[PDB]
C-alpha cells in the first residue's frame, strides 16, 4: 500500500486541510443528557456521530440515509469509528511559537535567525522589541530595543521603521529571510574564515539553511497560527460505574488553550491596556507549550490530583510511550499462562498442556471442526456444546492439536532459546509440564516459575514453529555452538553412579557376552553395578570419510558401563563410556554424537540418556545426611595453632617491632593459609576410603560419599561449598570492602553464633543488592546492543572482496589462552593457507573450516592464518554468507536473511548477569617485543621488553632466566574516553622539546617534510620518549589506557577491532563464558559506519561532514565509472548509543530514545524513511526483511527497480 514515510513542518493550510471543523468552545458534554455540545471538544458535527448511522436529532437513524447531512444538526450519518480519525483546528488569535523548535537544543529558530536563545525568549516573554523593517534608518534587523528606547526612536523617526514584540516579531523576521542569499554568504565566509570554531558555527547554520531550501519547508511554519485538535476517541471522556467519568489530561489542556484564546479575542474586541493583552498572549503561549510539551518551558501544570498533566510529547515518548508500550510490544490473543512442573516422561518435542487451557486457546478450531463433522448445526450450538464440555468435544480437541505446534515462553527472554515450539499433549491438571532437558535453555527451575503459551494460527506460522522454532532443531547454543540440552543434576548423578568403579564387588572378574548379559546379571543380583568384569563389545567406527568399520573385542569395564553402552548409538567408540561420567563426559558424548551422527540420533540419545540417568539415580538411593559432612580432625589443631601464633604476633606488635598495617596484612595472610590448609585436609579426608580386595589387602578407593559424589559428578556443588559445609567459612568482608581481621572458624555443620551470622549477613545483603542492580544494567546494555546491530542481515552470498583478518592463538604470558582451532572453527579463509616453509597450498580459498580441517591445521602446526571477517566485508547493506561463516546454532554456512545482528546482541547480552622474565619453554628467541618459539614454529611465549641473557636468534632452554566486568563491557562498547588517556604519536618524526609555557608543557615533532607540529602535554605526565628519536606513528609517548578512537585513527580498522575483541573476550573469559568473536566483529562493524569527509572532491559533500560510509562507497564507484574526482574520508568510531541515534531511519531512532530531538531534527530536515530495517516494519505491521520474509522484500526492490 505504502512504501515510505516522510516528516516535516505543518503549514496552516495543511492543518486546515486535515481539520473537519473549528473548535470554538471548551464544552465537552451536557451535564443532563450527556450529549456532545456544538462547536466543542466533542462536537458530533465536526468529529462524527456518537452512534452508528445515527444523528443527534434522531431523524436520520438507519442505513438508508448513509452519507447524508442532517439539515437541523449537521451530523453525518456514518460509522462512529470516524471519531478516531477526524481532527479539528483552533484559529489562534495571536501566533504562538512551537516549543520543540525553540527549546530543543540546538534551537532551530535561534540559529536560523543567528541570534541567541535568551534573546528570543525575551522577545517571546514580551520584554524587548525587535526591529523587523529598518527602512531608511540606521537600525539593523534583529537589534533589540527596550520599551523606553522604542518610544525614543519612535518619536525621533516615526513610521519609517517597524519594531514588534512576541512570536509575531519572530514570524516577521523568519518570513523576510532570503535563504539563498544567506547560504551564499555563509559559503563565502566559510572559505575566507581562519578560525575553525567559527567554521563549525557556520557549517551548522549552513546545513540547516540548505535543509530548509531543499525540503521545501518555510521557516515561518515554526510559528503556529492554526493549532490542530486530536480526535475525541483518542482523548476519551467515558463513564465508569456509579456515574463517575474518566477523562484525559489533553481535554484540560485543550480547554485551557481555548479559554485563553477566547479571552484574548474578547480583550482585543473590548479595547484593553497593552499590559493586559501582553499578559494574555503570555498565557496563550504558555498554554500551547504545556499542551505540546508539559514541563519543558518551566513549571509543569498539575491537575486536581496535584500531579503534572501528561501531554502529547509524553504520550508519544518514554518507556510507557506509544513506541515501546504499544508498537514494539503488544498484548496478544490466543495466549495463556500457567505454573510449570517437570515431565520426565516427555520427549524433546513434547510439552504437557492442561485440557481446560487448550480448550480455551483452541476454541475457534473446535467450533470449525464441530461444524465440519456435523455435530453442530450453527456456531451457537457449537458454543453451548463446548461450554457444556461433552466427550466428543474432547475428541475434537484431541484431533485439533494432533499436529498443531504451540510456543512456550519464559520471561525474561534473554536469547532466542527463551521461546520454543513444542507439540502439546493434553494432561489432566492445571500446570504445564516441561521437558527437563530444555530447562537450561529457559533458565527455568520449578520453585514457582510461570510460563506463557501462544498458538500460531496460519500455516506459515505453524511451519515456522515446526521448522525453525521446534525444540529438536535448537539444541546448539547460538552464542558458542556448544550443545544446550546437556543433562544436569539427577541425570548426571545417575550416570556418574552407574559408571563408578568399586573394589571387591559382587560378581567381580566375571565374563559377559555383552551388555544384555550385564543387564541380566544386574537384575538377577549376581553382579553389582560397580563390579569390574570383562565384556565382549562390538563397536562400530564411522570415520571422517564415512567408512563404517566394526570390531568385536574383549574390554575390561563395569556392569553399569555395559548397560549404558546398551543405549549408545552405533558409530561411537567405547572409550567415551569406559570411564566415570561427570557432566563434562556426558557433554563430550553428546558433542561427539552430534558431530559424527547428526540431529535425530542426538535427540534420541539425549532422551535415552536422561531416562537412564533418572532411573538409576532413583535406584541409587543417594541421600544427604548429617554424617556425610565429615570434619577433619586437623581443623581444630590448625585453628589452635593459628590462634596461638596470632597471640604471639600481637605480643610482638605490643613490642613495637612492626606497624599496624603490616600486622593486619600478615594476619590476613595466615588466616588465608589456614583456610586453604583446612580445606585441603577436609578434601583429602572426604575423597577416599580404605577397602578390602579379593586378596585381603587394604586398598585405596575413591569415596562414595553423597556430598563428594554430588560435587565430583558436577551435578551440584563445588569445592567451596563443601569447604563451608565441613571446613571453614573463611574470611568475610566488612560491607565497605575491608576484610575483618578475625575470620569465621565454624562451618555450617557445627553452627555459628551471633557475630559470625552477622558478618555473613553483611556480605549476603551486598550480594543480593548487586544481583538486583546488575540485572537491570545488563538489560539496558542488551537493549542498546540489539538496537545498534538490528539492521545487520545476511543479504548476499559472496561480496567479492579480498580483505581479511589475520588470526593467531592468544598468548598472555608463557602459556596459550586459546588454540587456533577454536578461533578458526567456522570461518572462511581469505587467502590460501600455505604450509610454513613451503609454497604448497594446503587449504584453498573460500573453504569452511570444520573439525576435519581444524585437525589438519593442528597437525601441520600453522601459527598464523587469515580468514574473512564481517567488518572487512564490503556489502552495501548487511553482510554476506562467506564473511560471516558457519551458523553456530545450525552447524552449516549461514543462510541468506539471517538476522545476525540480533543474534550477536543477544549472545553478548545474555551472560551479563554472570559478570561482576624466565623462559618456561625450550626454543628460540625473536625480537620485534620478546617472543619465545618452540622448534615446531609455534610462537608460544610473548613477553614485554621494558626500555637479556640471549640475543636474537639464540636458542633458550627451559628454566633459563633471559629477563567491574559489566561496566567495563559497557564502556568498551560505548567507546568511552579514559580519564587519563595515553598520548600517542600523531606522525613519524623526530621528537624535540619546546617552550615550557606556564600551566602546562608543550612538545614539538619534526616530520620527514620538515614541518613542525606542536603537542600540548600536561605537567604531571611521565614522558617516555627522548629528543632526537624518530618515533613511528602510533608509538606510546605517555603510558596509560589507550583510547579506541586514537588507535582507529593512527593504526587502522583491524587494530581497533582486535583491541575491542580482546578486551571483551578477556572480561567474558575471566568468568568462564564462551562467546564467539564474530558477534563482537558485527558490533564493531555497526560501530564503524560514519565518516568525516576530508577531501571534498566534487560529490556534494562539505568538508568535515559526518556522512555515512556505504553512501560514499557507492558514490565513489559511480565517480570512478565517470573517471571524475573521487572523495577522501576518515572513519570515525561511535558508541552503540551514538551510532543508534545516528541511523538513517528516524522511526527507529525515535523508538529508541530521545524521541523529541530526533523528531525535531527529522521534521526540520524533511527526512524520508524507506523502511529497510526490522524495527520500522515491526512498527508498521509489515514483514521483517529477515528470514522467511526476506525474499518477499527482495521482490519489492524487484518491482521498484522496474
Amino acid at each position: 500500500e505504502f512504501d515510505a514515510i516522510k516528516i516535516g513542518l505543518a503549514s496552516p493550510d495543511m492543518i486546515r486541510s486535515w481539520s473537519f471543523g473549528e473548535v470554538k468552545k471548551p464544552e465537552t458534554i451536557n451535564y443532563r443528557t450527556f450529549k456532545p455540545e456544538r462547536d466543542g471538544l466533542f462536537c458530533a458535527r465536526i468529529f462524527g456521530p456518537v452512534k452508528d448511522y445515527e444523528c443527534l436529532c434522531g431523524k436520520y437513524k438507519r442505513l438508508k440515509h448513509r452519507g447524508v447531512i442532517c439539515e437541523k444538526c449537521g451530523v453525518e450519518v456514518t460509522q462512529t469509528k470516524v471519531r478516531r480519525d477526524r481532527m479539528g483546528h483552533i484559529e489562534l488569535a495571536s501566533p504562538v511559537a512551537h516549543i520543540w523548535f525553540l527549546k530543543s537544543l540546538p534551537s532551530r529558530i535561534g540559529l536560523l535567525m543567528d541570534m541567541p536563545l535568551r534573546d528570543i525568549e525575551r522577545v517571546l516573554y514580551f520584554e524587548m522589541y525587535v526591529v523587523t523593517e529598518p527602512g531608511m534608518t540606521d537600525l539593523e534587523r534583529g537589534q533589540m530595543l527596550t520599551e523606553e528606547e522604542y518610544l525614543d526612536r519612535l518619536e525621533e523617526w516615526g513610521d519609517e521603521f517597524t519594531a514588534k514584540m512576541g512570536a509575531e516579531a519572530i514570524k516577521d523576521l523568519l518570513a523576510s529571510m532570503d535563504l539563498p542569499a544567506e547560504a551564499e554568504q555563509m559559503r563565502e565566509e566559510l572559505d575566507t574564515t581562519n578560525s575553525e570554531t567559527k567554521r563549525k558555527k557556520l557549517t551548522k547554520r549552513l546545513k540547516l539553511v540548505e535543509a530548509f531550501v531543499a525540503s521545501g519547508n518555510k521557516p515561518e511554519w515554526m510559528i503556529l497560527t492554526v493549532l490542530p485538535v486530536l480526535p475525541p476517541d483518542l482523548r476519551p471522556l467515558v463513564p465508569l460505574d456509579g456515574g463517575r467519568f474518566a477523562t484525559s489530561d489533553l481535554n484540560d489542556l485543550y480547554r485551557r488553550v481555548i479559554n485563553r484564546n477566547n479571552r484574548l479575542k474578547r480583550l482585543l474586541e473590548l479595547a484593553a491596556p497593552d499590559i493586559i493583552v501582553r499578559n494574555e498572549k503570555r498565557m496563550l503561549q504558555e498554554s500551547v507549550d504545556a499542551l505540546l510539551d508539559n514541563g519543558r518551558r518551566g513549571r509543569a501544570i498539575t491537575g486536581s490530583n496535584k500531579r503534572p498533566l501528561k501531554s502529547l510529547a509524553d504520550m508519544i515518548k518514554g518507556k510507557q510511550g506509544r513506541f515501546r508500550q504499544n508498537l514494539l510490544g503488544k498484548r496478544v490473543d490466543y495466549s495463556g499462562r500457567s505454573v510449570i512442573t517437570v515431565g520426565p516422561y516427555l520427549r524433546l518435542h513434547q510439552c504437557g498442556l492442561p485440557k481446560k487451557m487448550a480448550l480455551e486457546l483452541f476454541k475457534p478450531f473446535i467450533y470449525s471442526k464441530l461444524e465440519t463433522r456435523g455435530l453442530a448445526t450453527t456456531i451457537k450450538a457449537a458454543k453451548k456444546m463446548v461450554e457444556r464440555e461433552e466427550a466428543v468435544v474432547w475428541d475434537i480437541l484431541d484431533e485439533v492439536i494432533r499436529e498443531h505446534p504451540v510456543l512456550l515462553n519464559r520471561a525474561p527472554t534473554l536469547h532466542r532459546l527463551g521461546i520454543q515450539a513444542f507439540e502439546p499433549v493434553l494432561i489432566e491438571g492445571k500446570a504445564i509440564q516441561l521437558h527437563p532437558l530444555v530447562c537450561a535453555a529457559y533458565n527455568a527451575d520449578f520453585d514457582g516459575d510461570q510460563m506463557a503459551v501462544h498458538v500460531p494460527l496460519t500455516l506459515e506460522a505453524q511451519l515456522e514453529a515446526r521448522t525453525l522454532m521446534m525444540s529438536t532443531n535448537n539444541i546448539l547454543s547460538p552464542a558458542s555452538g556448544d550443545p544446550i540440552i546437556v543433562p544436569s543434576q539427577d541425570v548426571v548423578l545417575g550416570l556418574y553412579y552407574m559408571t563408578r568403579e568399586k573394589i571387591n564387588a559382587k560378581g567381580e572378574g566375571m565374563y559377559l557376552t555383552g551388555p544384555a548379559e550385564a543387564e541380566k546379571a544386574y537384575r538377577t543380583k549376581t553382579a553389582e553395578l560397580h563390579a569390574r568384569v570383562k565384556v565382549r563389545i562390538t563397536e562400530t567406527i564411522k570415520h571422517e570419510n564415512g567408512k563404517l568399520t566394526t570390531e568385536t573385542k574383549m574390554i575390561d569395564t563395569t556392569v553399569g558401563r555395559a548397560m549404558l553402552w546398551q543405549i549408545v548409538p552405533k558409530g561411537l567408540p567405547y572409550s567415551l563410556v569406559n570411564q566415570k561420567l561427570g557432566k563434562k563426559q556426558i557433554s563430550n558424548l553428546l558433542n561427539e554424537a552430534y558431530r559424527k551422527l547428526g540431529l535425530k540420533d542426538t535427540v534420541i540419545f539425549a532422551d535415552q540418556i536422561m531416562y537412564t540417568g533418572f532411573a538409576y539415580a532413583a535406584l541409587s538411593g543417594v541421600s544427604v545426611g548429617i554424617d556425610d559432612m565429615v570434619v577433619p580432625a586437623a581443623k581444630y589443631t590448625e585453628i589452635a595453632e593459628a590462634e596461638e601464633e596470632v597471640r604471639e604476633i600481637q605480643e610482638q606488635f605490643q613490642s613495637g617491632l612492626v606497624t599496624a598495617g603490616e600486622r593486619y596484612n600478615k594476619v590476613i595472610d595466615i588466616w588465608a593459609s589456614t583456610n586453604d590448609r583446612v580445606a585441603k585436609a577436609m578434601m583429602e579426608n572426604l575423597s577416599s576410603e580404605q577397602v578390602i580386595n579379593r586378596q585381603g589387602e587394604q586398598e585405596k578407593q575413591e569415596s562414595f560419599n553423597s556430598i563428594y559424589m554430588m560435587a565430583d559428578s558436577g551435578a551440584r556443588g563445588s569445592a567451596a561449598q563443601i569447604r563451608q559445609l565441613a571446613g571453614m567459612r573463611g574470611l568475610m568482608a566488612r560491607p565497605d570492602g575491608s576484610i575483618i581481621e578475625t575470620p569465621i572458624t565454624a562451618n555450617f555443620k557445627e553452627g555459628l553464633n551471633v557475630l559470625q551470622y552477622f558478618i555473613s549477613t553483611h556480605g549476603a545483603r551486598k550480594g543480593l543488592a548487586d544481583t538486583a542492580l546488575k540485572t537491570a544494567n545488563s538489560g539496558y546494555l542488551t537493549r542498546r546492543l540489539v538496537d545498534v546491530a538490528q539492521d545487520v542481515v545476511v543479504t548476499e552470498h559472496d561480496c567479492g572482496t579480498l580483505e581479511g583478518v589475520v588470526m593467531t592463538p592468544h598468548i598472555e604470558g608463557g602459556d596459550v589462552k586459546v588454540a587456533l582451532t577454536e578461533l578458526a572453527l567456522g570461518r572462511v579463509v581469505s587467502e590460501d593457507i600455505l604450509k610454513p616453509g613451503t609454497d604448497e597450498v594446503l587449504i584453498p580459498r573460500n573453504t569452511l573450516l570444520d573439525e576435519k580441517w581444524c585437525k589438519v591445521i593442528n597437525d601441520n602446526s600453522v601459527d598464523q592464518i587469515k580468514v574473512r571477517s564481517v567488518v572487512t566485508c564490503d556489502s552495501d547493506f548487511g553482510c554476506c554468507a562467506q564473511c560471516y561463516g558457519r551458523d553456530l546454532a545450525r552447524g552449516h554456512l549461514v543462510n541468506q536473511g539471517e538476522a545476525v545482528g540480533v543474534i550477536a546482541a543477544q549472545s553478548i547480552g545474555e551472560p551479563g548477569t554472570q559478570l561482576t622474565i624466565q623462559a618456561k619453554n625450550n626454543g628460540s628467541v625473536k625480537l620485534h617485543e620478546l617472543t619465545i618459539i618452540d622448534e615446531f614454529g609455534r610462537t608460544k611465549e610473548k613477553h614485554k621488553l621494558p626500555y637479556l641473557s640471549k640475543a636474537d636468534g639464540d636458542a633458550v632452554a627451559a628454566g633459563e632466566t633471559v629477563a567491574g566486568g559489566l561496566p567495563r563491557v559497557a564502556d568498551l562498547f560505548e567507546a568511552r574516553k579514559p580519564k587519563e588517556p595515553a598520548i600517542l604519536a600523531e606522525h613519524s618524526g623526530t621528537v624535540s622539546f619546546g617552550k615550557e609555557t606556564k600551566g602546562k608543557r608543550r612538545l614539538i615533532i619534526t616530520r620527514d617534510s620538515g614541518d613542525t607540529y606542536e603537542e600540548m602535554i600536561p605537567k604531571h605526565r611521565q614522558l617516555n620518549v627522548f629528543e632526537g628519536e624518530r618515533i613511528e606513528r602510533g608509538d606510546v609517548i605517555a603510558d596509560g589506557p589507550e583510547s579506541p578512537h586514537d588507535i582507529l585513527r593512527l593504526r587502522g580498522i583491524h587494530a581497533v577491532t582486535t583491541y575491542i575483541a580482546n578486551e571483551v573476550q578477556e572480561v567474558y573469559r575471566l568468568q568462564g563464558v564462551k562467546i564467539n568473536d564474530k558477534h563482537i566483529e558485527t558490533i564493531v562493524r555497526q560501530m564503524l559506519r560514519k565518516c568525516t569527509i576530508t577531501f571534498a572532491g566534487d560529490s556534494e559533500f562539505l568538508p568535515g561532514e559526518t556522512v555515512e560510509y556505504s553512501q560514499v562507497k557507492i558514490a565513489n564507484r559511480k565517480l570512478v565509472e565517470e573517471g571524475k574526482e573521487p572523495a577522501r574520508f576518515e572513519r570515525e568510531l561511535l558508541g552503540i548509543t551514538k551510532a543508534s541515534l545516528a541511523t538513517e531511519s528516524f522511526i527507529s531512532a525515535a523508538s529508541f530514545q530521545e524521541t523529541t530531538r530526533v523528531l525535531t531534527e527529522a521534521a526540520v530536515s524533511g527526512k524520508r524513511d524507506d523502511l529497510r530495517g526490522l524495527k520500522e516494519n515491526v512498527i508498521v505491521g509489515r514483514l521483517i526483511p529477515a528470514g522467511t520474509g526476506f525474499a518477499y522484500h527482495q521482490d519489492r526492490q524487484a518491482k521498484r527497480a522496474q
Binding site: 494432533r402 500455516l459 515446526r466
Partner: protein, 69 residues
Amino acid sequence: VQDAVEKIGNRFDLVLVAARRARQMQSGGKDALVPEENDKPTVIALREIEEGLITKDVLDARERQEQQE
C-alpha cells in the same frame, strides 16, 4: 525436518514452499501425493518435500500448466 531442509537447501525457502503446498491442499482441492496417515496439511507437505515429490520448480511448473488450461 532435516530431510526436507537437505532436499530444499534453505529452511526459509522450505517453509515458504511447504506453506504454499499446505494451502493448496487445504484451501484448494489438491490431493496429497503421499498417504495422509491422518496428518495435518503442513506435515503432509513436509513429507512430500522429504520424498522429493514437491519443490519450488515443480510447484511453478504445475501453476503454469494450470494457467495454460
